[PDB]
Amino acid sequence: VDMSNVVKTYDLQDGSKVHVFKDGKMGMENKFGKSMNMPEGKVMETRDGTKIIMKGNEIFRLDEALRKGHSEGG
C-alpha cells in the first residue's frame, strides 16, 4: 500500500486544493468534498504563489480505483 506515505496538497487560491497520485499526476479535488473537472493547462496558483499546472486532468483516479500493485509496474 504505502499509500499513507504518499501525500500532496497545494492550497489553491480558489479555496480548493489539488492532490497528486503515485503517477505524479495531479487531482482537482474541491474542498467541497467533491471533484471538479479542470481542463488541462488551467494554471493553478497557490496562496504562496506557487505556479502549478493541472497536469493530471484525469480526476477519474479519485473516483475509486483498480487498486494497482502499488509497487510493481509503476
Q: Which positions lie near Cu ion, rule CB under 5 A?
A: 1-2, 28, 38, 44, 54, 70
CB of 24 to Cu ion, least distance (A): 14
CB of 17 to Cu ion, least distance (A): 9
Residue closer to Cu ion by CB (options 64, 67) is 67
CB of 42 to Cu ion, least distance (A): 6
User: How many angstroms separate the CA atoms of 67 and 44, rounded?
Assistant: 28
- Cα 11 to chain centroid distance, Å, stands at 11
Residue closer to Cu ion by CB (options 28, 64) is 28
Residue closer to Cu ion by CB (options 39, 64) is 39
E strands, the chain, where? 10-11, 17-18, 28-30, 34-35, 44-45, 51-52
User: How many angstroms separate the CA atoms of 66 and 47, rounded?
Assistant: 33
